Paper text:
Two soluble fumarate reductases, Frd1 and Osm1, which are essential for anaerobic growth, have been identified in Saccharomyces cerevisiae. In the current study, we provide two structures for Osm1: one in a complex with its cofactor (FAD) and substrate (fumarate), and another in a complex with its cofactor FAD, substrate, and a second unexpected FAD molecule located in a newly defined second FAD-binding pocket.
The asymmetric unit contained one molecule, with the final model encompassing residues 32–501. The high-resolution structure of Osm1, in the presence of its cofactor and substrate, revealed that it comprises 17 helices, α1–α17, and 19 β-sheets, β1–β19, forming two distinct domains, a flavin domain (residues 32–268 and 386–501) and a clamp domain (residues 269–385). The FAD- and substrate-bound active site is located in the center of the protein at the interface of the two domains, each lining part of the active site. Fifteen amino acid residues, including A45, K66, N73, S74, S79, G80, V194, D260, E467, S482, and L483, from the flavin domain form hydrogen bonds of 3.5 Å or less with the FAD cofactor. Fumarate is located immediately next to the isoalloxazine ring of the FAD cofactor, having a direct interaction with the protein. S78, S79, H281, R326, H435, R477, and G480 from Osm1 are involved in the binding of fumarate in the active site through the formation of hydrogen bonds. Based on our analysis using SEC-MALS, we conclude that FAD- and substrate-bound Osm1 exists as a monomer in solution. Compared to the structures of other prokaryotic soluble fumarate reductases from the Fcc3 family, the most notable feature of the Osm1 structure was that it did not contain a heme domain, which is known to be critical for electron transfer.
Residue numbers in the entry: 31 to 501
The structure:
């Protein structure tokens, strides 16, 4: 394109980074990326499990069969009759293209799989190596922007510590500008005709939880302090439709930090830790109590009922085989005191469990024997405990508890990533787009692990492609 006013991208998580890279690399359309935080990446940079895609080269390599239709069925089942099905179709159908875009344009390997809760087959992609998926993907995308930016400063500028507070519209009402508070707290206007909200969720905000799912106000969260629903509020005040705001995901396994047990913020215990063979033990009895690989709403429901009302936590216990497959990530968790390597005798005594060591050994042996059916009917049992485990064998243990993690609702969007006007199917403004967690409609009542990184890519790409038509 010929260079006009910049496209303002609000938020440097994966949604904003996708949009920015696509605009600049494919179309040479200039971007200003604003983020109210002091660093790049949002909650995206913390993602530990990976990115979904159905019918990928990775899946072909690992001989896993999967299809857009299977992914959509898992997605609809998870949605429980909420959401916009056509956006679910788009998410799942364009998932192959999303993975391929990351692999080809950024040389991200995305060569390993995990099967997460609610998924019929393994389709959550991460790269081998020392770097977890959120960090790897964000670093690759951001480094590409910073490269371009060092080279033609007018094609891309990243401005941190810049909090958007409103969009300026004319009487018609086309976008004319983005109002933001700069690093010194001064009001500034960025003139623009096109803005993409990639500003993330609202899970950290107690005030918004009070408004939309007030039962969750006392729960801890995995979200960063920036996750305050700014975009959703701005766009609502401007006349945008919000949907599914009362659908908040509580992930069952936030880590408890044994040196800061009541922190309202938690490190996440990656769902991959269960997908790859971790089990959950009741914190008093020392026994398994539920299916660890259900959807998040279900696992969370079971811990909240079956673990103690006061002291609502569980023990995530992982064998040596899980350790071999998720070594760098368990190493990180151990360096932070979140996972401890302990013998079975010591587990019992350290965690004050009612079970004897010998009793727990008999139970881990039954769990691991796939010739006996699972007490709680777990759909995938891989990387279990060794047939000859004893009370002296070592296991890896962490304490986990339910945490506010993702907001499925948000501003309503169409298939072009355009924000929809309240009480209408028309766009609020041909200039206003949204992608990622700030949007609503894509997941319905529960989001499948892996699909938030994917939404960011699918809809960030779509916003850029559509702005390119209009620019
Ligand atoms: C611990 C953790 C682990 C996760 N793991 C996974 C995973 O394995 N797979 C998966 O699919 N999903 C995962 N998720 C969800 C996922 O990582 C992303 O957070 C989600 O996809 C949202 O990405 P996003 O780009 O929409 O928003 P974010 O990554 O939250 O980025 C939003 C950005 O917008 C900025 N912002 C907010 N308000 C303003 C404002 N007013 N002005 C300017 N900028 C603003 C923020 O500062 C932030 O940097 C995880 C989330 C957490 C917390």
């Amino acid at each position: 394109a010929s260079m006009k006013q910049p496209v303002v991208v609000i938020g440097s998580g994966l949604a904003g980074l996708t949009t920015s890279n696509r605009l600049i690399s494919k179309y040479r359309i200039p971007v200003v990326l604003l983020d109210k935080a002091a660093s790049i990446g949002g909650n995206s940079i913390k993602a530990s499990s990976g990115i979904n895609g159905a019918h990928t080269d990775t899946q072909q390599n690992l001989k896993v069969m999967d299809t857009p239709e299977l992914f959509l069925k898992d997605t609809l089942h998870s949605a429980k009759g909420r959401g916009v099905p056509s956006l679910m179709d788009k998410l799942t159908k364009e998932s192959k293209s999303a993975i391929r875009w990351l692999q080809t344009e950024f040389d991200l390997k995305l060569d390993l799989l995990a099967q997460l809760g609610g998924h019929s087959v393994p389709r959550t992609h991460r790269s081998s190596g020392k770097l977890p998926p959120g960090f790897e993907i964000v670093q690759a995308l951001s480094k590409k922007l910073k490269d371009i930016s060092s080279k033609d400063s007018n094609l891309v500028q990243i401005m941190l510590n810049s909090e958007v507070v409103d969009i300026e519209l004319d009487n018609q009402g086309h976008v004319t500008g983005v109002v933001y508070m700069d690093e010194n707290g001064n009001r500034k206007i960025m003139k623009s005709h096109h803005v993409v909200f990639c500003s993330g969720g609202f899970g950290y905000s107690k005030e918004m939880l009070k408004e939309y799912s007030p039962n969750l106000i006392h729960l801890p969260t995995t979200n960063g302090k920036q996750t305050t629903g700014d975009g959703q509020k701005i766009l609502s005040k401007l006349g945008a439709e919000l949907i599914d705001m009362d659908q908040v995901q509580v992930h069952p396994t936030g880590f408890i930090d044994p040196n800061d047990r009541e922190n309202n913020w938690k490190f996440l215990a990656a769902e991959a830790l269960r997908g790859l063979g971790g089990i959950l033990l009741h914190p008093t009895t020392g026994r398994r109590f539920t299916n660890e690989l259900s959807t998040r709403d279900t696992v969370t429901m079971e811990i909240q009922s079956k673990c103690p009302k006061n002291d609502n936590r569980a023990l995530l216990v992982m064998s040596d085989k899980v350790y071999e497959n998720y070594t760098n990530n368990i190493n990180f968790y151990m360096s932070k005191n979140l996972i401890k390597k302990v013998s079975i005798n010591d587990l019992i005594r350290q965690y004050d469990l009612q079970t004897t060591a010998s009793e727990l050994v008999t139970e881990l042996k039954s769990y691991s024997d796939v010739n006996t059916k699972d007490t709680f009917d777990r759909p995938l049992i891989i990387n279990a405990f060794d047939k000859d485990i004893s009370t002296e064998s070592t296991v890896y243990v962490g304490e986990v508890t339910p945490v506010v993690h993702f907001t499925m609702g948000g501003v309503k969007i169409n298939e072009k990533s355009q924000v929809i006007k309240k009480n209408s199917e028309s766009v609020l403004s041909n200039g206003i787009f949204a992608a990622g967690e700030v949007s609503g409609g894509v997941h319905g009542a529960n989001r499948l692990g892996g699909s938030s990184l994917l939404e960011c890519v699918v809809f960030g790409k779509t916003a850029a492609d559509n702005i390119a038509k209009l620019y």
